[PDB]
Design an enzyme around this catalytic site. Structure first.
Site, PDB file in Angstrom:
ATOM      1  N   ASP A   1       0.779  -1.033  -0.187  1.00 48.42           N
ATOM      2  CA  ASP A   1      -0.042   0.195  -0.568  1.00 48.42           C
ATOM      3  C   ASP A   1       0.980   0.741  -0.214  1.00 48.42           C
ATOM      4  OD1 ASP A   1      -2.109   2.117   0.358  1.00 48.42           O
ATOM      5  OD2 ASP A   1      -2.648   1.164   2.368  1.00 48.42           O
TER       6      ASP A   1
ATOM      7  N   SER B   1      -0.376  15.704 -12.067  1.00 50.29           N
ATOM      8  CA  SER B   1      -1.100  15.287 -13.916  1.00 50.29           C
ATOM      9  C   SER B   1      -1.089  16.418 -14.562  1.00 50.29           C
ATOM     10  CB  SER B   1      -1.816  14.709 -13.480  1.00 50.29           C
ATOM     11  OG  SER B   1      -2.199  14.031 -15.184  1.00 50.29           O
TER      12      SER B   1
END
Length: 330
Positions: free
Chosen positions: A35, A199
């Site tokens: 994770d 992004s």
């Protein structure tokens, strides 16, 4: 040193991936959910409330000759999906894919929430976010990666998740045969303890690319792709009959649909998520309403590039002094 381990979807939807991890001496192999959005290595154990164990493999520290109680240490964690776990702490030898850390904090669960109990395939979590998020008290502990870092050939690990198929976590090296073209690296903020990056935009299907900054985290421990409501609305508007359902808890779409791809930007590069990756199947057995793999982050408080996005790429988690993230197509 290096390590290399195969990671395997827990079910036919890729709801999560499990990776075998050797703990203790002799080795006890547990299948852990790696994770990159948390920083605790915790396991089902011989100390876990019996009614809360249902098919998991447990760590038994009393059977490990290298286990040592970390005296006074406790841990307690709550995840974004509302699940939680807590307990005490041992140090022990932990190996992943041939890479061995001695003195790793292994957090033994005394209590786990129902979501964990009900998932028989996940024996615990192995956190790969920054150690500043580790919940052990009163002495915070380091992640497996942080402990391994100095010994690694290169201070990196890579996530190569498969679509409906196994993939690979590598530690200490970049497998140049595992991706196509070049790796595009992008800046990371560690201010929130995550692999947080920005992004450069998105496209829906064959649509034009929208240049826009989307701050989010690379999170292998989250199934879906959670993005701003604007972006998500634009995606599902291209699927006839798709709608957001409060009763179901997100966007659903007719199972008869052909889903468009979704592209996200990494610098000047582009990662394409095929439409099929965005299909998470019937909302209930036999339903013709299917659950979408791109959902709104509104109310989460952060955008999450979860497995839906990451499995479309070869992803480098660069833990150099100034961390960065790399993405390649594959």
């Amino acid at each position: 040193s290096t390590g290399s381990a195969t990671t395997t979807p827990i079910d036919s939807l890729d709801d999560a991936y499990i990776t075998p991890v050797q703990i203790g001496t002799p080795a006890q192999t547990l299948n852990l959910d790696f994770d990159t959005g948390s920083s605790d290595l915790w396991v089902f154990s011989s100390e876990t409330t019996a009614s809360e164990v249902d098919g998991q493999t447990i760590y038994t520290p009393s059977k490990s000759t290298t286990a040592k109680l970390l005296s006074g240490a406790t841990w307690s964690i709550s995840y974004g999906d509302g699940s939680s776990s807590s307990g005490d702490v041992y140090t022990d030898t932990v190996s992943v894919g041939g890479l061995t850390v001695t003195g790793q904090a292994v957090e033994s669960a005394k209590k786990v929430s129902s979501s964990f109990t009900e998932d028989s395939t996940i024996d615990g979590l192995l956190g790969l976010a920054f150690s500043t998020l580790n919940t052990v008290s009163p002495t915070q502990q380091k992640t497996f990666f942080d402990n391994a870092k100095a010994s690694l050939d290169s201070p990196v690990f890579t996530a190569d998740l498969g679509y409906h198929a196994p993939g690979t976590y590598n530690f200490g090296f970049i497998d140049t045969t595992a991706y196509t073209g070049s790796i595009t690296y992008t800046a990371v903020s560690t201010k929130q303890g995550f692999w947080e990056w920005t992004s450069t935009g998105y496209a829906v299907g064959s649509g034009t690319f929208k240049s826009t900054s989307i701050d989010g985290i690379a999170d292998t421990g989250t199934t879906l792709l959670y993005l701003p409501a604007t972006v998500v609305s634009a995606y599902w508007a291209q699927v006839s009959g798709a709608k957001s359902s409060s009763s179901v808890g997100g966007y659903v779409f007719p199972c008869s649909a052909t889903l468009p791809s979704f592209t996200f930007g990494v610098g000047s590069a582009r990662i394409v998520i095929p439409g099929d990756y965005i299909d998470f199947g019937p909302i209930s057995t036999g339903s013709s309403s299917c659950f979408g793999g791109i959902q709104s982050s509104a109310g989460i408080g952060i955008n999450i590039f979860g497995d839906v996005a990451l499995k479309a790429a070869f992803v480098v988690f660069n833990g150099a002094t100034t961390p960065t993230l790399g993405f390649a197509s594959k």
